[model samples]
Target: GSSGSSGFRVGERVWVNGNKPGFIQFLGETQFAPGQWAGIVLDEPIGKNDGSVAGVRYFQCEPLKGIFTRPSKLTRKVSGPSSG
Candidate 1:
């Protein structure tokens, strides 16, 4: 059962092999049903506003460590502004 609880916290590092890294900024549930919602600050802001890509806003992440079907979704599609 879904805990219905927000996972991860602000400033948590989310990294995956062969993909862009992300940082957990907020976590909650969205209007769309399915699973938990993870709001992450992408490593890069995307050009387009696709569901999987990151725009000027944050990206929604979900559980994937031995939980979700595939790991490809773990990596976000965006190149955020530099930190420094």
Candidate 2:
């Protein structure tokens, strides 16, 4: 997992369904989901979990700003950011 782990590296910027915008925080086998899940911290408080799922803390972020989604459902796109 040096250069490529889940296509979206932890701490890397990304977008969600062109509606929600967030960054990759957690990745691996989730305690709830069937496969790997991504912990994304949204720019706004419009998310589901708070960086924790099933009493497991995958990452840390503001309340109501954390979300978990599949890596295939994310995109490496952040308009006007220089570096991501």
Candidate 3:
């Protein structure tokens, strides 16, 4: 049988809530919320945290460049920033 590395990898490019796109830096359980969460470094600085939520540090990134959400909220796609 074929096996994948968990549900999502650490470097998988994914779409965050809305048009914000980001890469997964951390993905696991959280104390602030129920079940698992996805720590992504968003392309824009429209995020909430720097991968840290509450008093727990999950991952790291620039200020206002990281966000957390459920795995179901992350949509997989190949959308890229436009240079044109």
Candidate 4:
């Protein structure tokens, strides 16, 4: 399967699920999941949490702006940031 790892870095901008664009805020494992998870701050307010999951906080950002997802859900963005 193509769902392996995202291999993302902090501050790196990427596309989420080939749709939404965002910046990688956090990159590591979380108390909520097993493997690694990317804490992304989306360009739009279409996220679930503000870097917090279950009850533990990982990073800080605007509410509903921060979200945690698998690396496979993200793809490296070579072009500039998304506008809308």
Residue pairs in candidate 2 whose N, alpha carbon or C atoms collide under 3 angstroms: none
**Best TM-score among the predictions, by candidate number:** 4
RMSD (Cα, Å) of model 3: 5.8
For each candidate in the order shown, give its overall lDDT on alpha carbons: 0.42, 0.81, 0.80, 0.82
Of candidates 3 and 1, the better by lDDT = 3
Model 3 segments more than 4 A misplaced: 1-6, 78-84
Estimated TM-score per prediction? 0.38, 0.76, 0.76, 0.77
Per-residue C-alpha lDDT of model 1 across residues 1-84, encoded as one tens digit per residue: 766743345566654343546665545554443455554444565312323432233344443221111222454345566659
Task: Tell how far residue 51 is off in model 3, in angstroms.
Answer: 1.9
* Tens digit of per-residue lDDT, candidate 2, span 1-84: 377574677888878776788878888778777788778999998887888876878888898899888889887675656655
Q: Please give the TM-score that candidate 2 achieves against the real structure.
A: 0.76
The superposed Cα distance between candidate 3 and the true structure at residue 46, in angstroms, equals 0.2
- Top candidate by lDDT: 4
- lDDT, ranked from best to worst: 4, 2, 3, 1
Better of 3 and 4 by lDDT: 4
Better of 1 and 2 by lDDT: 2
Task: List the candidate 1 regions with Cα displacement exceeding 4 Å.
Answer: 1-7, 16-18, 46-84
CA-only RMSD, every prediction: 12.0, 4.8, 5.8, 6.8
